[PDB]
Design a protein around this ligand. Structure first.
Ligand code: 7W6
Ligand code: CA
Length: 123
């Protein structure tokens, strides 16, 4: 369930969430090998974030959360701790995407997975 994350991405980046789908080697389902750039690192970190949440008993692929965006930043909320954790993982990713808007390159969008090489960096 990707609706709330995609919304958070759009608010923070000024780009459709689709622009971060299949981006590089890590943005989109799964991921492996070496991250192509800083945006892709955000996604590697985000994958790691979700792994920690699964180990905690949460299901961050599916959790539904609440959030708002003021000038103070992104406010995360939800009924359960797992929902709030999911929002936090997503928030850090959205902020990481915004922050690295400078090096976002369109060539890495829809990256052929055959072009991903190197080792897989650990969490
Ligand atoms: C940025 C991103 C993701 C990540 O943060 C990532 N680390 O791979 C992501 C994603 O990662 C979650 C995962 O692989 O556990 C799955 C599908 C689309 C994804 N996207 C693109 C996306 C995100 C939200 C809504 C839409 Br529509 C598209
Ligand atoms: Ca991924």
């Amino acid at each position: 369930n990707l609706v709330q994350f995609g919304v958070m991405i759009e608010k923070m980046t000024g780009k459709s969430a689709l622009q971060y789908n299949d981006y590089g080697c890590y943005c989109g389902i799964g991921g492996s090998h070496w991250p192509v750039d800083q945006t892709d690192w955000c996604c590697h970190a985000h994958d790691c974030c979700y792994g920690r949440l699964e180990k905690l008993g949460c299901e961050p692929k599916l959790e539904k959360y609440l959030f708002s965006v003021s000038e103070r930043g992104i406010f995360c909320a939800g009924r359960t701790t797992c929902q709030r954790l999911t929002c936090e993982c997503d928030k850090r990713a959205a902020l990481c995407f915004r922050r690295n808007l400078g090096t976002y390159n369109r060539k890495y969008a829809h990256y052929p997975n055959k072009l991903c090489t190197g080792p897989t960096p650990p969490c």
